[PDB]
């Protein structure tokens, strides 16, 4: 649509313009984080819980034909062996380990279980609930036929060959992706209420998923094989909504990738196009705060829009990408959010897409703030990853000190 106006990221709530990087970082950034927490995603009640324990359950030094070390880590959210946990899978390129250099990392959540990212028969088969839409499941549990069922979204061998570790966690370890899933999620025990319905500003699945990414980063900071200052957080679609909210809240993430995150991710909500606030909240009432429902059919009242979420990543490199046929995500709305975030990146001396309108397919545009659109439907393809790997080579924090 063409009948909206956006709030200016560089004007504070009180009307005073943001003229320097220090004002952005110390005043405007907290102001915008609070607006998103209260009105959109809900409040993250705390970060790392006390007594988080990391247990390496398996470590294989000759995975993928010798190309990788594969570690499985249980990240347990409390010292009691009964405490809730999540299962992290890490592949690290053996070429980099052998050189005794710490590897940079791509970290993102997976849709249907760690065993779906690669056929590798040694990955632990998740025993947690999975959605009916997961390929090759039965009775909401994974089967052996589900191994590698999502490998098309995870070019592990290529990422490793280019020098990067691959870390992942099943989103459903943190919040099962079902409308009732919060009652079996992190939110059900982390600073939980004594009873009754969740409060208007209480976080939902996207907040919980984002929090899990930050807990994975807490683990990576302890692993001698990796450089936890060089972690690119990425996600596809609903898990890209989570990646953006994680990268915005947690400035330790060195680079952020939104692959087709759409509504409530990179796409402008005020631009009424494809999925709308009412449709996302109606179909997925667990994803956002209950407060976000106030904007159902009333996006004009939103005090922020998603360009300000993208701006919260600055000055760190941010990639937003779309698919040409993916109308529901609103590709032009994703691009326009990038353009409306660009002035903040520019304040930090970075540059964004330089063209007038959505670029031609498979021609990325921008510096540390980058956009591309590829042909085809919603998905995450080898072409997307080729562009992300080039971006990481150029813009991920270097291993060398300043
Ligand atoms: O944020 C919400 C939590 O406050 C909620 O916590 C539940 C409250 O009722 C108690 O009987 C339960 O033990 C407790 O888990 O869980 C859902 C979450 O959305
Ligand atoms: O926010 C987006 C969701 O609205 C979208 O939901 C899909 C719409 O197509 C249906 O056929 C699917 O069942 C449903 O998953 O998923 C992508 C997400 O970004
Ligand atoms: Mg939309």
Author numbering: 31 to 432
Q: What's the paper's own text on this?
A:
Glucuronyl esterases (GEs)4 are enzymes able to cleave ester linkages connecting lignin to glucuronoxylan in the plant cell wall. GEs belong to the α/β-hydrolase superfamily and possess a catalytic triad common with serine-type hydrolases. OtCE15A is an interesting member of CE15 and the α/β-hydrolase superfamily in that it features acidic residues at both the canonical and noncanonical positions (Glu-290 and Asp-356). Here, we have investigated by mutagenesis the residues involved in catalysis and carbohydrate binding in the enzyme OtCE15A and, furthermore, present a series of structures of OtCE15A with different ligands, including monosaccharides and, for the first time in CE15, di- and oligosaccharides.
In light of this, the OtCE15A structure determined with two xylobiose molecules upon soaking with the mixture was not surprising, although it serendipitously reveals interesting features of OtCE15A. One of the xylobiose molecules is found in the active site of the enzyme with a xylose moiety binding analogously to GlcA and XUX, except for the lack of the C5 carboxylate and the xylobiose being β-linked instead of the α-linked GlcA in XUX. The presence of xylobiose in the active site suggests that xylose or xylooligosaccharides might inhibit the enzyme reaction. Indeed, kinetic characterization revealed that xylose inhibits the BnzGlcA esterase reaction with a Ki of 48.1 mm. The second xylobiose is bound in a site located about 25 Å from the active site with the sugar packed between a short helical region and a loop comprised of residues 222–228. The xylobiose is modeled such that it packs with the nonreducing end projecting into the cleft and the reducing end projecting away from the protein. The sugar makes only a few interactions with the protein, with only hydrogen bonds between the main-chain amino of Ala-223 and O2 of the nonreducing xylose residue and between the main-chain carbonyl of Ser-218 and O3 of reducing xylose residue. This loop region in other OtCE15A structures (residues 220–227) has large B-factors likely resulting from considerable movement of the loop. However, in the presence of xylobiose, the B-factors of this region are reduced significantly. However, an alternative hypothesis could be that the protein can interact with xylan chains not only in the active site but possibly also in other surface-binding sites similar to those found in other CAZymes.
